[PDB]
Amino acid sequence: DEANIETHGMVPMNRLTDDPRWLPAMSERVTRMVQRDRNHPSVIIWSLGNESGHGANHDALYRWIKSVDPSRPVQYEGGGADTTATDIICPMYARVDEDQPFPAVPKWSIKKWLSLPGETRPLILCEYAHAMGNSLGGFAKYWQAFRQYPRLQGGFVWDWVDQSLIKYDENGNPWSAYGGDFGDTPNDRQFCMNGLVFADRTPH
Amino acid sequence: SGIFRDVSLLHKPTTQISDFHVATRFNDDFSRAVLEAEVQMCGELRDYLRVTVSLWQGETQVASGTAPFGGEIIDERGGYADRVTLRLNVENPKLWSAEIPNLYRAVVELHTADGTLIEAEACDVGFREVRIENGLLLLNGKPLLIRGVNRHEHHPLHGQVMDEQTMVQDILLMKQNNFNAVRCSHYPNHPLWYTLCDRYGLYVVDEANIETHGMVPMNRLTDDPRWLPAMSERVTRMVQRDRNHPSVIIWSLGNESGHGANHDALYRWIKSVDPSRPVQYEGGGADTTATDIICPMYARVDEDQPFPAVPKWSIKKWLSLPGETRPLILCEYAHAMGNSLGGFAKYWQAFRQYPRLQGGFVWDWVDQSLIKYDENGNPWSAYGGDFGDTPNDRQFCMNGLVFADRTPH
Numbered sequence: 001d002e003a004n005i006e007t008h009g010m011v012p013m014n015r016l017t018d019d020p021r022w023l024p025a026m027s028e029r030v031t032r033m034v035q036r037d038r039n040h041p042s043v044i045i046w047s048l049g050n051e052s053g054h055g056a057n058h059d060a061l062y063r064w065i066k067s068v069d070p071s072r073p074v075q076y077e078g079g080g081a082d083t084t085a086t087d088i089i090c091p092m093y094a095r096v097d098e099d100q101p102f103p104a105v106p107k108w109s110i111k112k113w114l115s116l117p118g119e120t121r122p123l124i125l126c127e128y129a130h131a132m133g134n135s136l137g138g139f140a141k142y143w144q145a146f147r148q149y150p151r152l153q154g155g156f157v158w159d160w161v162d163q164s165l166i167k168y169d170e171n172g173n174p175w176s177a178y179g180g181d182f183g184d185t186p187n188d189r190q191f192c193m194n195g196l197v198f199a200d201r202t203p204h
Numbered sequence: 205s206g207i208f209r210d211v212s213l214l215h216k217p218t219t220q221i222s223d224f225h226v227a228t229r230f231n232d233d234f235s236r237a238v239l240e241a242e243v244q245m246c247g248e249l250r251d252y253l254r255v256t257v258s259l260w261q262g263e264t265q266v267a268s269g270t271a272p273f274g275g276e277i278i279d280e281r282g283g284y285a286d287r288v289t290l291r292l293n294v295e296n297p298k299l300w301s302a303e304i305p306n307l308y309r310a311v312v313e314l315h316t317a318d319g320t321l322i323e324a325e326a327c328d329v330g331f332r333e334v335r336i337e338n339g340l341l342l343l344n345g346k347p348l349l350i351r352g353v354n355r356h357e358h359h360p361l362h363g364q365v366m367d368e369q370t371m372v373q374d375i376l377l378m379k380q381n382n383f384n385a386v387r388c389s390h391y392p393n394h395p396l397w398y399t400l401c402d403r404y405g406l407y408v409v410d411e412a413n414i415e416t417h418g419m420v421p422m423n424r425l426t427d428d429p430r431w432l433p434a435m436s437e438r439v440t441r442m443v444q445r446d447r448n449h450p451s452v453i454i455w456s457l458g459n460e461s462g463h464g465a466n467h468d469a470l471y472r473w474i475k476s477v478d479p480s481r482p483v484q485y486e487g488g489g490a491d492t493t494a495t496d497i498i499c500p501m502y503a504r505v506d507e508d509q510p511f512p513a514v515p516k517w518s519i520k521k522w523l524s525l526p527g528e529t530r531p532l533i534l535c536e537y538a539h540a541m542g543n544s545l546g547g548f549a550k551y552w553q554a555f556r557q558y559p560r561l562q563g564g565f566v567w568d569w570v571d572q573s574l575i576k577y578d579e580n581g582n583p584w585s586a587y588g589g590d591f592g593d594t595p596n597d598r599q600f601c602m603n604g605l606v607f608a609d610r611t612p613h
């Protein structure tokens with residue numbers, strides 16, 4: 001269960017989440033979610049949101065949840081996937097064997113990440129195996145590693161269904177549309193279609 | 205068998221230096237060190253006796269301390285009237301490593317207040333700190349990458365007798381071939397080897413002479429209290445002899461002797477006595493309570509070998525097993541028997557990629573072949589069974605990176 005907080009277009013990403021003036025607004029996004037959903041057995045883990053860097057607001061909220069509901073781990077991937085605001089190493093698109101050593105927020109190979117000095121948490125990818133189009137190449141490599149390494153406990157494929165929308169041609173027939181097809185600009189074209197199934201649920 | 209190492213006579217005074225230990229501790233950035241030397245005497249105590257410990261950098265004395273005998277109070281019955289500890293401050297010390305084997309000379313003088321020397325003892329001192337922190341083996345605060353090899357004391361003509369020439373040849377070839385460490389497989393070596401490793405610069409794993417591989421199960425003796433005494437001497441006497449060598453960075457409890465409670469007791473004895481070096485031991489699964497470093501033999505890079513009780517996990521996976529945090533350095537890997545070393549690059553790639561994979565010791569340096577002569581007087585390389593020995597394990601003794609005569613494979 002994840003809080004409705006994403007500030008991906010900010011520069012740097014944590015501009016708002018490190019800002020106390022934004023603490024109240026963020027706080028309601030997390031607290032009201034917990035108050036509403038805390039009795040559902042299916043929710044096993046709380047998430048602080050997505051792609052909003054790592055800011056002090058996050059640390060505050062992570063502690064708030066730990067305090068009010070000790071029954072579920074709290075995870076958050078911003079700021080490098082392994083910050084003080086996450087009980088689980090939960091990267092997005094980290095590779096099996098290959099490191100992607102970006103400055104500040106590297107994406108280590110998952111096998112290596114578990115054993116960096118001092119690291120002891122479990123690792124479950126919050127997003128992996130980007131299913132956009134003709135994709136999922138190398139999926140088996142992830143599964144082989146999840147099964148061999150105890151602390152590699154899986155992940156969440158990105159993602160279930162294509163975000164295509166139906167439009168009608170001059171003759172009224174339907175067709176699958178994406179970014180920019182409504183006159184929207186700027187837009188990100190087909191990047192909105194990354195699922196394992198088409199928008200009508202037919203499988204890819 | 206036989207008298208295979210030197211025999212000497214040593215004449216000491218009745219009032220003498222009977223032991224001395226040199227320790228070097230540092231500040232946070234190694235810019236300052238304290239050299240502490242505990243000195244013990246045998247003989248008649250006299251108020252006029254003194255001990256001076258002097259530290260030299262080449263022909264320059266850099267520090268010194270002098271004191272009468274008489275240790276600090278240690279318990280309800282007092283202190284050691286027959287010991288003294290000297291503490292020397294050393295600024296900006298030149299640090300020892302296998303890359304730059306900087307050494308100083310410590311001279312320990314037993315003398316009188318008024319200047320007469322009774323006797324002196326001495327050692328080369330390498331200022332270096334060995335510690336494990338956060339899961340990494342650090343030397344002077346930096347994590348090591350062990351390019352090691354296991355080396356037995358073997359000569360095709362002389363058997364197990366070692367000589368300076370051969371030892372020097374081996375160190376030169378090792379260094380020339382980018383090795384930076386050696387494991388004394390599997391017993392303390394001839395004394396001179398330590399002095400050469402200190403001076404030429406190689407990291408050394410000093411191993412006690414205990415191997416009980418042939419017992420069933422392997423720890424039958426090492427788990428038995430009745431053998432604790434014999435075992436203990438093998439470890440304690442090694443430490444007593446080699447503790448002041450800077451090249452020695454890690455102590456090992458022996459080899460292929462399973463994991464017995466005797467190991468645990470001895471591990472703790474070393475940790476108490478010499479907190480300056482980690483203790484390792486591979487027996488019983490390579491990651492027991494008797495080892496500070498996970499130190500498997502022949503574990504593979506990516507492939508698991510899930511043997512009951514004593515599995516050999518892929519080294520990458522071993523590191524991250526639930527609750528594991530230790531560094532991993534293979535005590536033996538890359539079995540160099542005949543046409544071998546296939547897959548060697550796979551190891552290196554892993555070691556470079558994973559901080560906690562800090563290298564290993566190849567098995568092994570030199571082929572244990574022996575020279576024989578045919579009807580004509582022409583020599584040839586012999587192996588097990590070639591001396592009428594049986595049962596025997598044939599060519600199992602030739603696993604080196606070099607032939608017995610030091611020619612490379």
Ligand code: NA
Nearest residue numbers: 146149150152
């Ligand atoms: Na797993």
Ligand code: NA
Nearest residue numbers: 191192193194
């Ligand atoms: Na997308």
Ligand code: NA
Nearest residue numbers: 555558559561
């Ligand atoms: Na490494």
Ligand code: NA
Nearest residue numbers: 600601602603
């Ligand atoms: Na052998």
